[PDB]
Amino acid sequence: GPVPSRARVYTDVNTHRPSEYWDYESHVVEWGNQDDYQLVRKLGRGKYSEVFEAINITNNEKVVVKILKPVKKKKIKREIKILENLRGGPNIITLADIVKDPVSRTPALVFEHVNNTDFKQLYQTLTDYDIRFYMYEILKALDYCHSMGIMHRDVKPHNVMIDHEHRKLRLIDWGLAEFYHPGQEYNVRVASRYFKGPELLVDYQMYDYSLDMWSLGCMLASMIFRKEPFFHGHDNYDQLVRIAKVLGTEDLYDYIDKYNIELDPRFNDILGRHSRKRWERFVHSENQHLVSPEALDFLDKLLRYDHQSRLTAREAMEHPYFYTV
Ligand SMILES: CC(C)c1ccccc1-c1ccc(C[NH3+])cc1Cl
């Protein structure tokens, strides 16, 4: 069978805490008063959620209400417990309240409001220092949730809210987040296609916090090279081929051999043979203002097939790319 693996950092943080911390199924959810909130307008619509701007009538504070389609109760309990555990963490979205709709029995999470601006609109005003600054803010959030024995498992631009005016960043959407337990085999059907790590794509279940560091690398690559998404797969199999076209096929086969992974037969038909590309090959006149040798060295240390070989969030914080922050 596959070779076992464990996180290089925060390995046993959940083993040493009482069951109450990580046993989300036993968590008792208590509802606030839905009448304390007046819906203003629709902001977005997720996979299993509708998002509204609202105001807390009791204190005239603007909030965001995430109305959840109750498809899986266990999943709701998991998101709530994690948000409760991480509440007050650096750059972690604050869960302010949990409420229910009496008539339709619909649960809703209430969050602090963030005056967000999308990636496409943000890029034009972003300087090299700004990317270093915000990347460091994401790292503080990841080092914090990893230290708390939690893997985010859905790191992507749509899950990072940025109020550029106030230079305020918040890591959101903890619906796919999970507690890390060494030796545990997790569901690989997590993260969004473009950000899925190689461990997910080759069905290696014993993954850890390093999954988020791959997703962070995908984000950095799309910014510094202005290629969104960086690895543009059309399905989960094709996603690995797009990674192999950059990282080369040699290091991929070294990875599957190292962990004794049984690669799906479909890959022989589509994977092929690819050289390992130099990161400098993606530099052009439109994107060169956000590229530096430090940026490329840093990217090289995140975007590695071997999940054990990627920088942890704390190691990433110590990289020369962030000496200016
Ligand atoms: C600077 C920032 C951390 C970043 C780096 C790499 C890729 C994208 C982004 C990014 C993330 C979220 C949002 C707002 N939803 C906007 C942007 Cl520009």
For the chain, which residues make up each domain, given as ranges?
Answer: 5-22+114-325, 23-113
Burial 191-225 (b: 16+ CB within 10 A, else e): bbbbbbbbbbbbebebbbbbbbbbbbbbbbbbbbb
In ligand 1, which atom is closest to the CA atom of 158? 15
- In this structure, what are the phi and psi dihedrals at residue 168, rounded to the nearest 5 degrees? -115, 125
Q: Angle 217-219-223 (CA atoms, 0-180°, nearest 5)?
A: 115
Please, which residues have CB within 8 angstroms of residue 318's CB and are 6 or more apart in sequence? none
What is the length of the chain?
A: 325
Query: Could you tell me if 223 and 123 are in contact, meaning their C-beta atoms sit under 8 angstroms apart?
Result: yes
Amino acid at 6: R
Domain 23-113, classified CATH 3.30.200.20, yes or no: yes
Beta bridge partners of 112: 63
Closest CA to 156 of 198, 94, 218: 218
Q: Prior bond to 229 cis, omega within 30?
A: yes
* Residues with active-site annotation: 154
Helix pair 249-258, 236-247: axis angle to 10 deg:
120
Query: Could you tell me if 36 and 108 are in contact, meaning their C-beta atoms sit under 8 angstroms apart?
Result: no
Whose CA is closest to atom 11 on ligand 1?
Answer: 157
- Residue by residue, DSSP assigns 222-268 as HHHTT-SSSS--SSHHHHHHHHHHHH-HHHHHHHHHHTT----THHH
Instruction: Please give the C-alpha separations between residue 323 and each of 193, 199, 220, in angstroms, as whole numbers.
Output: 32, 31, 17
Determined by X-ray
Look at the domain 5-22+114-325 and name its fold: Transferase(Phosphotransferase); domain 1 (1.10.510)
Task: Give dist(CA 9, CA 288) in Å, integer.
Answer: 34
**C-alpha dihedral (218, 204, 308, 196), degrees to nearest 10:** 10
- Residue by residue, DSSP assigns 158-177 as GGEEEEGGGTEEEE---TT-
Whether 220 lines ligand 1, by a CB cut-off of 6 Å, is yes
Task: Give dist(CA 137, CA 131) in Å, integer.
Answer: 10
